Amino acid sequence: SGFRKMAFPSGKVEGCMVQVTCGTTTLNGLWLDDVVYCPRHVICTSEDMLNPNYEDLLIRKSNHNFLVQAGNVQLRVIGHSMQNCVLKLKVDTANPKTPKYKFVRIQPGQTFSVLACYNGSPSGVYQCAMRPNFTIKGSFLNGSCGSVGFNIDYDCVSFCYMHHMELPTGVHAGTDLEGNFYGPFVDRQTAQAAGTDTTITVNVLAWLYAAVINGDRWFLNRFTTTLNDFNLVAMKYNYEPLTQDHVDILGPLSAQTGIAVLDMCASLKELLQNGMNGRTILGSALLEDEFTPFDVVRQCSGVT
Amino acid sequence: SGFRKMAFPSGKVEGCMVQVTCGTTTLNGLWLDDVVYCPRHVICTSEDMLNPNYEDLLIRKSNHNFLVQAGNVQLRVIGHSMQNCVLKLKVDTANPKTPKYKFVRIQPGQTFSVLACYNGSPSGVYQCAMRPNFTIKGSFLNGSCGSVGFNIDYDCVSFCYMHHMELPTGVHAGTDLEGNFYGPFVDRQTAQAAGTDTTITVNVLAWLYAAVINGDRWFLNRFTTTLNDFNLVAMKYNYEPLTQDHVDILGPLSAQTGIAVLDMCASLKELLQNGMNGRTILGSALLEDEFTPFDVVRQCSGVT
Numbered sequence: 287s288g289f290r291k292m293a294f295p296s297g298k299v300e301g302c303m304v305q306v307t308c309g310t311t312t313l314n315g316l317w318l319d320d321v322v323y324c325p326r327h328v329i330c331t332s333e334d335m336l337n338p339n340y341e342d343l344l345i346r347k348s349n350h351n352f353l354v355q356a357g358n359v360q361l362r363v364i365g366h367s368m369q370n371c372v373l374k375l376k377v378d379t380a381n382p383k384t385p386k387y388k389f390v391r392i393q394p395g396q397t398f399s400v401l402a403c404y405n406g407s408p409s410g411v412y413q414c415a416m417r418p419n420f421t422i423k424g425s426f427l428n429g430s431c432g433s434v435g436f437n438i439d440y441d442c443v444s445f446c447y448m449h450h451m452e453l454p455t456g457v458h459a460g461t462d463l464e465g466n467f468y469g470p471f472v473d474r475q476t477a478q479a480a481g482t483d484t485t486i487t488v489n490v491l492a493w494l495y496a497a498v499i500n501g502d503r504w505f506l507n508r509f510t511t512t513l514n515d516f517n518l519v520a521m522k523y524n525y526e527p528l529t530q531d532h533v534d535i536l537g538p539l540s541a542q543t544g545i546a547v548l549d550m551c552a553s554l555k556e557l558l559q560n561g562m563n564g565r566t567i568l569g570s571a572l573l574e575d576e577f578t579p580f581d582v583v584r585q586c587s588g589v590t
Numbered sequence: 591s592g593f594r595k596m597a598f599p600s601g602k603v604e605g606c607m608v609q610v611t612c613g614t615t616t617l618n619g620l621w622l623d624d625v626v627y628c629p630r631h632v633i634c635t636s637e638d639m640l641n642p643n644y645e646d647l648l649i650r651k652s653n654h655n656f657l658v659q660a661g662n663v664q665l666r667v668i669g670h671s672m673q674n675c676v677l678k679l680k681v682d683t684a685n686p687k688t689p690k691y692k693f694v695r696i697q698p699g700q701t702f703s704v705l706a707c708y709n710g711s712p713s714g715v716y717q718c719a720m721r722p723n724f725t726i727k728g729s730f731l732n733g734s735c736g737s738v739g740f741n742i743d744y745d746c747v748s749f750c751y752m753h754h755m756e757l758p759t760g761v762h763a764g765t766d767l768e769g770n771f772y773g774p775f776v777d778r779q780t781a782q783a784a785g786t787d788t789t790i791t792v793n794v795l796a797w798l799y800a801a802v803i804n805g806d807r808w809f810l811n812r813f814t815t816t817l818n819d820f821n822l823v824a825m826k827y828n829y830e831p832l833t834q835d836h837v838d839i840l841g842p843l844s845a846q847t848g849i850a851v852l853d854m855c856a857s858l859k860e861l862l863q864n865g866m867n868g869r870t871i872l873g874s875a876l877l878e879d880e881f882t883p884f885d886v887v888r889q890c891s892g893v894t
């Protein structure tokens with residue numbers, strides 16, 4: 287028992303981290319097979335960042351301007367290209383530590399682990415969720431760009447995120463591994479406000495099921511509700527509307543605990559309406575929404 | 591910016607995890623050089639667990655009864671011995687992935703990362719603190735025994751914890767890598783209640799400094815206090831007494847923010863006395879105590 291914000295083991299990803307330098311800018315790169323993936327803003331100077339013309343900036347760059355270092359050894363760059371907001375640097379050596387991998391674009395509400403890196407070196411690993419407004423509430427400092435988000439299915443690493451920037455609001459924006467930003471964000475140092483950060487309702491319910499499994503049951507009540515009644519409450523509290531797809535995904539947790547999804551929605555409704563009254567659930571004094579139903583099942587079953 | 595419960599990258603530790611089986615019991619082992627470390631209760635049957643005589647149980651075991659598997663390859667066991675509550679299985683092959691390592695016995699209040707494992711395979715990584723009552727609030731299921739806690743200083747992995755058991759209270763107990771339990775716990779399935787779980791005051795203050803650095807400043811007040819006045823409040827709220835050693839350790843955070851340690855104690859005093867009033871600090875609705883002052887500096891400076 288016990289329930290923690292758990293990240294995937296980061297070993298497979300640590301073996302892919304490299305340092306990429308272009309001019310006076312150094313950030314992180316992801317070396318998979320014979321390609322190094324990194325944010326295209328590596329070609330920018332501090333002046334360029336305000337309104338960069340990436341196509342024009344890249345014309346002035348040759349393969350030899352991209353310095354790629356894997357630990358203490360320099361990789362030879364034999365090609366470069368821009369795909370959306372990422373650069374793909376073709377190197378002459380396949381990464382011997384390349385794990386089995388996929389590139390996936392995640393949905394808002396999905397969680398992933400981040401291996402924060404500086405100068406191609408890992409500093410820490412933490413669990414994240416892609417917010418409904420497509421930002422991530424990470425922990426990143428200048429130099430962390432190019433750090434990646436991922437999930438792992440046994441031996442396959444699914445890369446879903448590459449860190450690009452911090453919004454003036456202190457939240458983070460980035461792309462999938464094809465270089466497409468999550469949300470409306472652009473790789474430019476300009477005012478980019480995030481939309482309403484709604485709560486991921488299906489995740490809060492999944493976390494309430496994890497609480498019941500682990501012994502924290504005080505919030506269980508004598509009530510039930512309907513999807514429509516629940517959603518009136520979810521709208522008032524800036525929670526995502528719950529759909530029948532969400533109920534279906536919560537099915538295994540509902541079956542394991544014997545608590546119908548709509549009964550758990552009624553417990554959630556009372557918690558939204560009344561608050562926690564100074565009580566805690568799984569050591570938290572607020573409703574946690576960065577555990578998906580899959581995360582709860584994985585953690586509560588011990589999947590390796 | 592942003593502040594997360596960050597674990598160390600787990601790669602160096604993943605390379606050490608093996609599966610150890612003795613009879614019908616399988617748990618995790620730590621392979622460093624030519625030795626595999628694991629909880630001695632691997633020699634117990636379910637009946638034995640109630641009151642085991644480990645010395646007598648071990649007499650019936652030979653090197654060939656300890657099955658040690660590293661991934662899909664079997665290690666040959668050439669010696670076995672019991673050191674306190676751990677078994678050391680001498681194998682004929684040095685682990686090629688052995689990192690630079692140390693065995694350290696941590697102090698209550700210190701934090702570490704846990705690589706939870708099942709059948710010698712890593713499932714996740716999370717950040718922990720050794721509670722003042724010497725328990726850890728982990729996330730561990732049956733089969734997780736032998737999973738280890740550690741810290742990393744650049745290239746050196748300091749192993750501090752090996753998981754042994756779950757108390758009837760759902761909290762976790764284990765040993766250092768010399769097999770000595772943290773706290774009064776014994777490796778026996780018996781009633782072992784934990785003492786008062788006090789709050790790690792120096793860590794809460796470190797986390798308040800992290801909040802100020804990251805922009806969350808609402809809790810800063812116009813007051814100050816003294817160590818003695820602060821400690822009267824800390825005692826009432828089951829917080830650890832703050833010492834001048836703690837103030838000294840908070841020195842760099844105090845210098846960076848310009849907020850004197852005693853002024854931050856006065857903010858903490860008001861937060862204990864008044865609560866958060868439905869507000870949050872670094873996305874938390876309670877006072878977080880599982881970040882040491884070193885963790886805050888490391889995360890806020892980007893140490894790799």
Ligand SMILES: O=C(Cc1cccnc1)N1CCC[C@H]1c1noc(C2CC2)n1
Binds near residue numbers: 451452453473
């Ligand atoms: O956000 C960062 C880096 C950073 C800092 C903290 C956390 N995570 C990332 N920066 C640094 C330069 C100014 C600003 C910036 N604005 O746009 C860009 C890129 C073109 C997209 N960069």
Ligand SMILES: O=C(Cc1cccnc1)N1CCC[C@H]1c1noc(C2CC2)n1
Binds near residue numbers: 733734735757777779
């Ligand atoms: O605690 C665990 C395993 C477990 C389960 C959940 C989390 N972490 C560890 N068990 C399983 C058998 C009964 C009980 C037990 N009591 O003592 C022992 C060892 C002799 C010390 N084991």
